Every structure is written in C-alpha cells, then in structure tokens.
Amino acid sequence: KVFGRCELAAAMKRHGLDNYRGYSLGNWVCAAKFESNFNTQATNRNTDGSTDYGILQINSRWWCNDGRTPGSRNLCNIPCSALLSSDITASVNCAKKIVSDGNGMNAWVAWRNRCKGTDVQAWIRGCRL
Amino acid sequence: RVDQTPQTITKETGESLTINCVLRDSNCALSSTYWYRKKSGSTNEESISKGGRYVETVNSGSKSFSLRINDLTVEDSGTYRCKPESRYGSYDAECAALNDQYGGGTVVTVNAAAHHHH
C-alpha cells in the first residue's frame, strides 16, 4: 500500500506516535516519507545481507528476523514479513521500541538527513487533524 | 575505530587493573559492549562475565567504556579485547562497519612469585 501523506498522518495519530517520547507527529510522517516514500511494501537489501522492511524501513539485523540475516537479534520479537503489512500496527510498535533504544529518532538515518532540525509540523499541515 | 589502552599490563597477585575503550569521534551510538579473552596457554577466545571481580563502567556520552578486574591471580593472564555494538533503526553502513571492530587488545600478565606484593 502507498499511503497518502495525510492518510498516514491520521493513522499515526491514532497509533499514539504524536509526542511519543517528545517527538511530535510530523517527525514520524516525515520519516516514513524519506525511508519508504510512504510505501508499506518497501524492502531494501543491504550489503551486510540484512534487509530493511516496510514504511519505516526496519532493519533485520537488530529488530525483526527474516531467516536470512546473519546474527539477527530480533529485538522486536516479530518476523519481518509482519512489517510489510497494509496495517501499520506492527511497524509502529517496533518504531516505539526502537525510539526507546537510547538514541531517540536518530536511529533512522533518512530522518536524520532530511527531517531533524527542519519545521516538521509542515508534514501534518493541511491534514485537518 | 575502537581505541583500547593500554597495550600491556603486568601485575602481582592481589592487584587490580583497568582496561579502557574509546569509540573515536562518531555519530554512532554505543548501544552495548562486549569483553573477550584468550587465556595464557590457549589459542581459543571466550567472553567475560560482568559482575563480581569484573567491574564495567560505560559512559555513552563520551562513547567510552572500561573493564576493571580486582584481585588478580595467574588465572587472569591473557589477551583482552573489547567490542562495541551500535544499533540503528534502518540501515547505516557507518554503524554496521563498527559492529565488526574489536579493540587493539591488552596482554595481561599476573606474576605469582614468592615474597612479591603490590
């Protein structure tokens, strides 16, 4: 599924991401923008033989297992296939543990390159939330 | 790059020692830390158990950590290496690189000689 921007903004508000850990909603919508392009099906194979999965591109080395990543620690306790869903629940709840891992939203490099320090509110503007 | 000081340490029975690791300038998080050693009279490397005589301090602001071992005997002789671990939500090649790096190592010798103290 390719979310539209305000559609994703409304589902993330419902899943409790707004101000979760001090990070307002825009940060989250913006992250899925530059990680997935709002695509729940997005996957990318990385050169360590790990894979990044779903709307927030969660990495198979640390968070989910997929049977073909060496040393997968499966910290969210879920198969990676769960994160490729239309329903953003699995990814949201694994996002919540990730953001709580010590480094806040700095875990997501696309977030760090394109959203951090910018006016991230803009991404929920014109969404009538 | 992971900087481990010092390179060698020689101590008498009963002393203690500090190995230090420093994760030299980077954006990458110190998410956790492993200590390993190769016993004297062995070429196989095993992991250390934090607790008891093995005091670890981790300072992730400064991206540093250290292993203190109290009350040495000849059983603590060997080579000691730290390895850091840096976790990221989505893939960062820079931080993945870091999970393959060990400290330089510290060769540690404990003398048990007669009439020899601290």
Curated annotation (Swiss-Prot), chain A:
Q: What is its EC number?
A: 3.2.1.17
Q: C-type lysozyme domain location, by residue?
A: 1-129
According to the UniProt entry, the coiled-coil residues are none
Which residues are annotated as active site?
35, 52
Q: Which UniProt keywords apply?
A: Allergen, Antimicrobial, Bacteriolytic enzyme, Disulfide bond, Glycosidase, Hydrolase, Secreted, Signal
Give an example GO cellular component term for this record: cytoplasm
Q: What is this protein called?
A: Lysozyme C
What family does this chain come from, according to its entry? Belongs to the glycosyl hydrolase 22 family.
Q: Please name the Gene3D superfamilies in this protein's record.
A: 1.10.530.10
Give the source's domain of life in one word.
Eukaryota
Something else the entry says is: Lysozyme C is capable of both hydrolysis and transglycosylation; it also shows a slight esterase activity. It acts rapidly on both peptide-substituted and unsubstituted peptidoglycan, and slowly on chitin oligosaccharides.
From the Swiss-Prot or TrEMBL record, state where the protein is found.
Answer: Secreted
**Any idea what job this protein has?**
Lysozymes have primarily a bacteriolytic function; those in tissues and body fluids are associated with the monocyte-macrophage system and enhance the activity of immunoagents. Has bacteriolytic activity against M.luteus.
Quaternary structure? Monomer.
Which reaction is catalysed here? Hydrolysis of (1->4)-beta-linkages between N-acetylmuramic acid and N-acetyl-D-glucosamine residues in a peptidoglycan and between N-acetyl-D-glucosamine residues in chitodextrins
Q: Which InterPro entries match?
A: Glyco_hydro_22 (IPR001916), Glyco_hydro_22_CS (IPR019799), Glyco_hydro_22_lys (IPR000974), Lysozyme-like_dom_sf (IPR023346)
List, alphabetically, the CDD domains matched. LYZ_C
Question: Where along the chain is substrate bound?
Answer: 101
The gene name on file is LYZ
Q: Name one GO biological process term.
A: defense response to Gram-positive bacterium
Where does this protein come from, organism-wise? Gallus gallus
